[PDB]
């Protein structure tokens, strides 16, 4: 370790440290534009200049601290008149051509420039103070221009900190934004229009100013006027970290909360821009059926009408069915209830053929430290932030040393424009997968056809050249990790062989399950008993539902209770009691990560109407059926988790489970795992969560399916409308349907009506 | 004058002299030596006891000796006997898990009400005060309001259409231990002072 | 002496008025900065995007909702001071007690410059058909209150 | 001089041409920004013929193929400005007494303008 | 005959009566008490609450109110009585209405003497049963 003395304070610090993070670790501080966490540090804005001695021999020019490595016995001056005088000059030069919209700028009080300006600007040289020296025409250009349905660019505001272009190349890897002409005439611009990356929203959080701004939430409130709620996203298994911004019971904005242990400071687009549905159409009063129709009732008229439908009910026809995002608490109760209430009709909306708890959870940090990545499925669609890790991984970037201020602002490790390794990953997905670019060993197969590829990798059959190339690298692999998702976890045959491959070799796994809390709900024993009535198989006769199921699993049943948060058409025609429930943005409880971690879920001040959690509602269904529930409120339910011995927040719960409930898969339609979920198709995310049907140009046109045409598609999961797409990377005869749910990775009988 | 003889003494015996450039100066006595040496001050010629302030440092950015602290202010009125007009503060930190501190009601009469208030609003006991009874807060108030961990208790302000405001979540103002709305704060936002 | 008008000074702190420019646009660009400085948490501002064809104000931003809870307000003018446009400005009306609490949050239409009188005064002059009499006079109307038509024979 | 006044008299006129062309070739005209010296003029006086400082001719996607600005009231070295975005072409029109709106020496007429904007539309326009 | 022209037209008068027979029992606290002694200078029905109502002092105003002739009115003077005012904390009752039914609220801090005049002039049009709310309804002459 190197002995550096910042101002008067001396500090230890590892050799590969920036003079910046040196000075921030010490306590002291400095201006800061272009440089960002997890982005390659450069000296472009030229504000972090400091004075440096390497005796007392002071260097003749000022050094940009963000791109200078600490030498041993170094001295850093950040206070001298020389420094400050410069600092205030760098402020001055920035504001030189800046716009003057502060009051009317969505970049509220949350604006790095504003702030720094008042922190270091307006030097005190020792008569009226001179606010502005520049007195000429400013830089007028393109203003208030939407790049996407989600992003709005203000060219005038841009201060050229290279953050966004820099971010696009490095993190996701989609060069969709870059600078244009040179000199004082340069601006930000695109020729990829759509803003094609599925990680475009993150520029919104990096931009130091208000050029790049989240348009989902233009002109809602000022930054201090938001009621920030630090929680977790439950749209998929990665379980990131967000903060929900509200004001007056409505959902305004989604930003990312920093949580290095999981998603670093990044968030995927469906999670950040798909939130307008929880705002809007909502079930607020419990409905009960009267004249073959539903009408407004009370929890009174409901708790009674509910005793009535369950009075003559046998305690085995009782079916408990949670949603894919049921809190760890909501599941413990559904277990105990279904325990005391002797039944085998207990399932969760996402549950996969093969228990995700089959494979030993690998730390999201282990992926960085691994040697090879064997991947089956599309990490982009199933577990999006994994794409952003594999990016770091592929560059041999390994976990940063932590300083007093946390994650470094200037990691000399991340060099700009790092060359990516094609030899560290293998990819096998039923299409031209996004990341097949960073994997030389890549091949496109047919759906469910992975059960055979897995046999191959073990060593009991021959596979394509690639498959063998892969098997070869996995052998030589010192400490690989195994990433797998849909068809792998949705096919008894394959999944089982998988566990083997990674059981023989001492290697961990990342299971990209179609249920957000799959790994946690399984840990509570929220899987069905030997009977067979599972979340899509109509077996129950009297059952509870915490989501909307396939039409076929409700028919013939005697009593149906739908615990929704919105009124689905299927429910208003087949249900007998509808109870209002909260979105995940407004639930209090815990979750279990795809990597076996446990994350807190906080409740946002949104408009719940007259809704109650499944925590409560379940106990109400417990009375209506005999034995009183062991759980009431959340304060007490927490003791029952502390009794199963599930570690506190941020910890990891080891829990393996050996058993598998298979099922035959009727290959006609493949339900393609996607980032956007289907209930997100509202407002702006209106087209980005529209379904789409893929087919190979021959078979495509061989079954009357034009290029860009809407098309009625019928399925065991319901009747969706979608645009059709020609893709040569798709096997002939098969049709890939955009499965925008936890119904992803399935093979299903279906047709297309005309 | 009479304060010189105070400082020339504290220096000698391990008492820390705290000094802001602005015109006040403290002297922090330990727990025990407080009672007696505080009497020493009255005899020295300190007749007037101007104030007595309670401080809870719980939410203070930099660490301090113990969680609580009380400050006393001593004077020599310049219109009496010989009194020079020496003034200053004397402070003592006080354990959190043991809020007791001997009274000076023996020495100054003003210290009566003043000590009572420091006890109402912070939980600090005074060994031997005529009657440690609540002064300002209503009789049935549970706990001690002026300390950091006791809520201000604010109501959301109300407007039409169910538009409401929560003062807590609204304040653009920062709390010193507060990180700010952007990554970090620095420069004049960590403290500013001009050079007259 | 509700028969002889109260003579108030030009600086007097009355019911807020929201001024317009000559052009007829409102001065307020919905910045919620007034609301920010306010000790009482008495101002609520919802912003909206101007329509270029039919504009409310000169920015790209106007004030969709503007609301002041007078039962919270203290009349400190801290707000008029924070404002970058010269929009919100304390006025002269003081005659403004009323019956239902939530009737004391004024709105944009309640405080524009063109409006003469307070909620009560205008509401009673409604079911009455007798024009509003303001119970005051002033020497002159401030430079700041451009437009505000008030009884100021002086 | 009074040339400052006459400059703005022409700045409105340029705008008029722009709005004409925009409806005549059926393309987007956009107010890009109002003078800050007008939004923040409090009670202060103001007498410029309009309030628009940055104006543009954008296309189908909203990307500008022509830009136009004019120096604020309280600014030094005043000129009006024509810039064709992606093609690095900047222009500086001043105002001569008894001559007109000139670009160094050439009269910037309604004729000459339309040429520039048509040339720019055909070429630069993305959609 | 509760709602018959006989009884009706009767109480119309009685009301119009105790309308001009209003005897104000000011209950001043802080700064507002001083502004009103600038309006009174130039067995009671109708009490005026002027200032910050403390939580310790709250139960006191209750007794004073209760023991009172039965036809009565409460005026809520200034910002601290009308709601918590600018003191949104523990110490202070957020709206005197929290304790006693208010008939008229008067904004200001402290409201000008002549405001408090309009305040009672309004309380008049109210006990006459001649005052309406912004919703266009007719207000009950007394809170109870
Ligand atoms: S980007 Fe920052 S400095 Fe520029 S107008 Fe917006 S808030 Fe102000
Ligand atoms: S648009 Fe934002 S992130 Fe992109 S370079 Fe400009 S200021 Fe930096
Ligand atoms: S990756 Fe998953 S957890 Fe993270 S923001 Fe996107 S959908 Fe949500
Ligand atoms: S006068 Fe004072 S209390 Fe009233 S809105 Fe203005 S700033 Fe707030
Ligand atoms: S400070 Fe002025 S311009 Fe800003 S919102 Fe308030 S009144 Fe409108
Ligand atoms: S409303 Fe104002 S004048 Fe009246 S008591 Fe409260 S602070 Fe004093
Ligand atoms: S030069 Fe921009 S932060 Fe170092
Ligand atoms: Ca545009
Ligand atoms: Mg626009
Ligand atoms: Mg919304
Ligand atoms: Mg106590």
UniProtKB/Swiss-Prot annotation, chain B:
Annotated Gene Ontology cellular component terms: plasma membrane
Bilayer topology: Peripheral membrane protein
Keyword Heme belongs to the record: no
Protein name per UniProt: NADH-quinone oxidoreductase subunit 5
Catalytic activity of the protein: a quinone + NADH + 5 H(+)(in) = a quinol + NAD(+) + 4 H(+)(out)
Gene from which this protein is expressed: nqo5
One family name in Pfam for this protein: Complex1_30kDa
EC number: 7.1.1.-
Localisation: Cell membrane
GO molecular function, one term: quinone binding
EC primary class: translocase
Lineage start: Bacteria, Thermotogati, Deinococcota, Deinococci, Thermales
Organism: Thermus thermophilus (strain ATCC 27634 / DSM 579 / HB8)
From Swiss-Prot, chain C:
Cofactor(s) essential for the protein: [4Fe-4S] cluster
Source domain of life: Bacteria
Binding site for [4Fe-4S] cluster 2: 38, 73-74, 76, 79
GO cellular component, one term: plasma membrane
Documented EC number(s): 7.1.1.-
Domain 4Fe-4S ferredoxin-type residue range list: 18-48, 64-93
Protein name per UniProt: NADH-quinone oxidoreductase subunit 9
Cell compartment(s), UniProt: Cell membrane
Protease as UniProt keyword: no
Record note on cofactor: Binds 2 [4Fe-4S] clusters per subunit. The [4Fe-4S] clusters are referred to as N6a and N6b.
Subunit structure: NDH-1 is composed of 15 different subunits, Nqo1 to Nqo15. The complex has a L-shaped structure, with the hydrophobic arm (subunits Nqo7, Nqo8 and Nqo10 to Nqo14) embedded in the membrane and the hydrophilic peripheral arm (subunits Nqo1 to Nqo6, Nqo9 and Nqo15) protruding into the bacterial cytoplasm. The hydrophilic domain contains all the redox centers.
One biological process term in Gene Ontology: aerobic respiration
Family: Belongs to the complex I 23 kDa subunit family.
Main location (coarse class): membrane
Catalytic activity entry: a quinone + NADH + 5 H(+)(in) = a quinol + NAD(+) + 4 H(+)(out)
GO molecular function annotations of the record: 4 iron, 4 sulfur cluster binding; iron ion binding; NADH:ubiquinone reductase (non-electrogenic) activity; quinone binding
Binding-site positions, [4Fe-4S] cluster 1: 28, 31-32, 34, 83
Topology within the bilayer: Peripheral membrane protein
Keywords: 4Fe-4S, Cell membrane, Iron, Iron-sulfur, Membrane, Metal-binding, NAD, Quinone, Repeat, Translocase
Curated annotation (Swiss-Prot), chain D:
InterPro entries (alphabetical): Frataxin/CyaY_sf, NADH_quinone_OxRdtase_su15, NADH_quinone_OxRdtase_su15_sf
Subunit field text: NDH-1 is composed of 15 different subunits, Nqo1 to Nqo15. The complex has a L-shaped structure, with the hydrophobic arm (subunits Nqo7, Nqo8 and Nqo10 to Nqo14) embedded in the membrane and the hydrophilic peripheral arm (subunits Nqo1 to Nqo6, Nqo9 and Nqo15) protruding into the bacterial cytoplasm. The hydrophilic domain contains all the redox centers. Nqo15 is bound to the side of the complex near the N-terminus of Nqo3, where it interacts with subunits Nqo3, Nqo2, Nqo1, Nqo9 and Nqo4.
Protein name: NADH-quinone oxidoreductase subunit 15
Superkingdom to which the source organism belongs: Bacteria
Classification lineage: Bacteria, Thermotogati, Deinococcota, Deinococci, Thermales
Entry comment, domain topic: Has a similar fold to the mitochondrial iron chaperone frataxin.
Primary subcellular site in the record, as a coarse category: membrane
Catalytic reaction equation(s): a quinone + NADH + 5 H(+)(in) = a quinol + NAD(+) + 4 H(+)(out)
Membrane topology, as annotated: Peripheral membrane protein
Protein family: Belongs to the complex I Nqo15 family.
One annotated Gene Ontology cellular component of this protein: plasma membrane
Major enzyme class: translocase
From Swiss-Prot, chain E:
Cofactor binding: number and manner: Binds 1 [4Fe-4S] cluster per subunit. This [4Fe-4S] cluster is referred to as N2.
Record-linked Pfam families: Oxidored_q6 (PF01058)
Cofactor(s) the protein requires to work: [4Fe-4S] cluster
Membrane topology of this protein: Peripheral membrane protein
An example Gene Ontology molecular-function term: iron ion binding
S-S bridge residues: none
GO annotation, biological process: aerobic respiration; electron transport coupled proton transport
Predominant place of localization: membrane
Residues binding [4Fe-4S] cluster, per UniProt: 31-32, 80, 109
A cellular-component GO term for this protein: plasma membrane
InterPro entries reported in the protein's UniProt record: NADH_UbQ_OxRdtase-like_20kDa, NADH_UQ_OxRdtase_20Kd_su
UniProt cross-references to PROSITE patterns, sorted A to Z: COMPLEX1_20K
Broadest EC class assigned to this enzyme: translocase
Catalytic activity: a quinone + NADH + 5 H(+)(in) = a quinol + NAD(+) + 4 H(+)(out)
Subcellular location: Cell membrane
EC number, UniProt record: 7.1.1.-
Protein role: NDH-1 shuttles electrons from NADH, via FMN and iron-sulfur (Fe-S) centers, to quinones in the respiratory chain. The immediate electron acceptor for the enzyme in this species is menaquinone. Couples the redox reaction to proton translocation (for every two electrons transferred, four hydrogen ions are translocated across the cytoplasmic membrane), and thus conserves the redox energy in a proton gradient required for the synthesis of ATP.
Family: Belongs to the complex I 20 kDa subunit family.
Protein name: NADH-quinone oxidoreductase subunit 6
Species lineage: Bacteria, Thermotogati, Deinococcota, Deinococci, Thermales
Gene that encodes it: nqo6
């Amino acid at each position: 370790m190197v002995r550096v003395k910042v101002n008067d304070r001396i500090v230890e610090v590892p050799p590969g440290t920036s003079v910046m993070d040196a000075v921030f670790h010490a306590g002291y501080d400095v201006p800061l534009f272009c440089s960002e966490k997890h982005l390659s540090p450069i000296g472009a804005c030229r504000m972090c200049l400091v004075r440096i001695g390497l005796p007392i021999q002071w260097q003749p020019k000022l050094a940009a601290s963000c791109v200078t490595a600490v030498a041993d016995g170094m001295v850093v001056d950040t206070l001298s008149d020389v420094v400050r005088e410069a600092q205030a000059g760098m402020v001055e030069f920035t504001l030189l051509n800046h716009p003057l919209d502060c009051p009317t700028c969505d970049k509220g009080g949350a604006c790095e420039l504003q702030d720094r300006t008042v922190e270091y600007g307006l030097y005190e040289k020792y008569e009226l103070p001179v606010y502005t020296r520049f007195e000429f025409t400013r830089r007028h250009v393109d203003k208030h221009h939407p790049l996407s349905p989600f992003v709005i660019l203000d060219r005038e505001r841009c201060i050229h900190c290279k953050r966004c272009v820099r971010y696009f190349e490095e993190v996701p890897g989609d060069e969709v934004l870059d600078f244009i002409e040179r000199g004082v005439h340069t601006f930000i611009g695109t020729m990829d229009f759509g803003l094609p990356s599925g990680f475009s929203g993150n520029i919104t959080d990096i931009c130091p100013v208000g050029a790049l701004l989240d348009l989902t939430a233009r002109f809602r409130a000022r930054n201090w006027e938001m009621e920030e709620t630090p929680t977790t996203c439950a749209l998929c298994p990665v379980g990131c970290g967000i903060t929900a911004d509200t004001r007056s019971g409505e959902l305004l904005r989604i930003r990312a909360r920093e949580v290095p242990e999981v998603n670093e400071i990044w968030i995927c687009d469906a999670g950040r821009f798909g939130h307008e549905w929880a705002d809007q159409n909502r079930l607020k009063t419990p409905l009960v059926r009267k004249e073959g129709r539903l009408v407004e009732a009370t929890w009174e008229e409901a708790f009674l009408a509910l005793k009535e439908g369950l009075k003559e009910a046998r305690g085995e026809e009782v079916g408990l069915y949670l949603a894919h995002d049921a809190t760890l608490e909501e599941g413990l109760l559904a277990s105990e209830l279904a325990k005391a209430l002797k039944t085998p009709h207990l399932d969760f909306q996402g549950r996969t053929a093969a228990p995700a708890s089959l494979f030993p959870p690998a730390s999201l940090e282990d992926l960085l430290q691994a040697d090879f990545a064997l991947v089956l499925g599309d990490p982009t669609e199933e577990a999006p932030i994994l794409h952003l890790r594999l990016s770091e991984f592929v560059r041999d970037l390994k976990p940063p040393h932590r300083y007093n201020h946390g994650t470094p602002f200037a990691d000399l490790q991340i060099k700009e424009r790092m060359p990516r390794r094609t030899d560290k990953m293998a990819l096998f997905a039923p299409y031209r997968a996004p990341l097949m670019k960073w994997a030389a060993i890549h091949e496109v197969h047919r759906p469910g056809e992975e059960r055979e590829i897995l046999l191959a990798l073990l060593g009991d059959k021959e596979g394509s050249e690639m498959v063998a190339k892969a098997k070869e690298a996995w052998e030589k692999a010192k400490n690989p990790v195994l990433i797998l998702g849909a068809g792998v976890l949705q096919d008894t045959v394959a999944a089982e062989r998988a566990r083997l491959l990674a059981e023989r070799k001492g290697a961990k796994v990342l299971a990209m399950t179609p249920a957000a809390n799959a790994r946690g709900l399984e840990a509570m024993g929220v899987l069905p008993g030997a009977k067979g009535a599972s979340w899509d198989e109509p077996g129950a006769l009297y059952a509870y539902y915490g989501f909307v199921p396939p039409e076929e699993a409700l028919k013939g049943k005697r009593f149906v209770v739908m615990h929704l948060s919105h009124l689905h058409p299927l429910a208003e025609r087949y249900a007998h009691v509808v109870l209002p429930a909260p979105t995940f943005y407004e639930k209090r409880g815990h979750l279990v990560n795809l990597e076996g971690r446990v994350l807190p879920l906080s409740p946002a001040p949104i408009e719940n109407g007259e809704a109650e959690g499944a925590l409560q509602v379940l106990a109400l269904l417990a009375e209506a059926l005999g034995v009183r529930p062991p759980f009431r409120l959340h304060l007490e339910a927490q003791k029952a988790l502390k009794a199963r011995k599930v570690p506190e927040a941020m910890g990891r719960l080891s829990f393996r489970l050996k058993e598998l409930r298979p099922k035959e898969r009727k290959g006609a339609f493949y339900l393609r795992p996607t980032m956007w979920k289907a209930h997100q198709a509202v407002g702006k995310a209106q087209e980005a969560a529209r379904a789409e049907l893929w087919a190979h140009p021959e078979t495509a046109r061989a079954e009357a399916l034009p290029e860009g045409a809407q098309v009625a598609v019928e399925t065991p999961f319901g009747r969706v409308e979608a645009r059709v797409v020609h893709r040569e990377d798709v096997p002939k005869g098969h049709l890939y349907l955009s499965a925008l749910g936890p119904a992803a990775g399935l093979r299903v009988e279906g047709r297309v009506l005309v | 004058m009479r304060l010189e003889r105070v400082l020339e003494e504290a220096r000698a015996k391990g008492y820390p002299i705290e000094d802001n450039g602005l015109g006040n100066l403290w002297v922090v006595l330990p727990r025990e030596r407080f009672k007696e040496e505080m009497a020493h001050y009255k005899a020295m010629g300190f007749n007037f006891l101007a104030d007595i302030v309670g401080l809870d440092y719980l939410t203070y950015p930099d660490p301090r000796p113990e969680r609580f602290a009380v400050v006393y202010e001593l004077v020599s009125l310049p219109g009496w006997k010989d009194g020079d007009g020496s003034r200053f503060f004397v402070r003592v930190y006080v354990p959190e898990e043991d809020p007791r501190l001997p009274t000076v009601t023996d020495l100054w009469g003003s210290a009566n009400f003043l000590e009572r208030e420091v006890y109402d609003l912070f939980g600090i006991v005074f060994e031997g005060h005529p009657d440690l009874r609540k002064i300002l807060t209503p009789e049935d108030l549970e706990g001690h309001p002026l300390r950091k961990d006791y809520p201000l208790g604010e109501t959301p302000t109300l407007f039409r259409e169910g538009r409401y405001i929560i003062p807590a979540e609204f304040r653009a103002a920062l709390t010193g231990k507060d990180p700010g709305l952007t990554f970090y704060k620095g420069g004049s936002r960590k403290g500013y002072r001009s050079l007259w | 002496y509700p028969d002889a008008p109260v003579a108030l000074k030009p600086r007097f702190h009355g019911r807020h008025v929201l001024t317009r420019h000559p052009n007829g646009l409102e001065k307020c660009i919905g910045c919620s900065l007034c609301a920010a400085a306010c000790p009482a948490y008495a101002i609520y501002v919802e912003p909206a995007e101007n329509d270029p064809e039919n504009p409310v104000s000169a920015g790209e931003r106007y004030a969709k909702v503007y609301e002041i809870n007078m039962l919270r307000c203290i009349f400190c003018g801290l707000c008029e001071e924070a404002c970058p446009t010269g929009a919100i400005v304390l006025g002269y009306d003081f005659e403004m007690a009323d019956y239902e609490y939530s009737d004391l949050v004024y709105g944009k239409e309640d405080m524009l410059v063109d409006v003469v009188g307070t909620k009560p005064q205008r509401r009673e002059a409604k079911r009455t058909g007798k024009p509003v009499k303001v119970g005051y006079v002033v020497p002159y109307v401030r430079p700041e209150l451009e437009g505000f038509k008030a009884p100021t024979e002086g | 001089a009074s040339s400052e006044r006459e400059l703005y008299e022409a700045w409105v006129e340029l705008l008029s041409w722009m709005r004409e062309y925009a409806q005549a070739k059926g393309v987007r005209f956009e107010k890009e920004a109002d003078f800050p010296d007008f939004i923040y003029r409090m009670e202060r006086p103001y007498d410029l013929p309009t309030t628009i400082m940055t104006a543009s001719l954008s296309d189908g996607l909203g990307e500008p193929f022509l830009l136009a600005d004019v120096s604020p009231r309280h600014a030094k070295l005043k000129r009006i400005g024509l810039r064709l975005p992606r093609a690095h072409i900047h222009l500086h029109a001043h105002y001569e007494p008894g001559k007109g709106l000139v670009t160094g020496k050439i009269p910037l007429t309604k004729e000459r303008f339309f040429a520039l904007a048509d040339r720019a539309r055909e070429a630069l326009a993305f959609a | 005959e509760r709602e018959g022209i006989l009884f009706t037209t009767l109480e119309k008068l009685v009301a119009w009566g105790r309308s001009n027979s209003l005897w104000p029992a000011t209950f001043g606290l802080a700064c507002c008490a001083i502004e009103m002694m600038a309006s009174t200078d130039a067995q009671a029905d109708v009490m005026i609450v002027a200032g910050r109502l403390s939580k310790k002092m709250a139960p006191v105003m209750r007794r004073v109110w209760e023991q009172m002739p039965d036809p009565k009115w409460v005026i809520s003077m200034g910002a601290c009585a009308s709601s918590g005012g600018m003191f949104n904390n523990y110490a202070i009752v957020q709206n005197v209405d929290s304790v006693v039914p208010v008939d008229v609220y008067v904004p200001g801090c402290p409201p000008r003497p002549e405001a408090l005049i309009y305040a009672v002039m309004q309380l008049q049009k109210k006990v006459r049963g001649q005052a309406y709310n912004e919703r266009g309804e007719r207000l009950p002459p007394v809170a109870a």
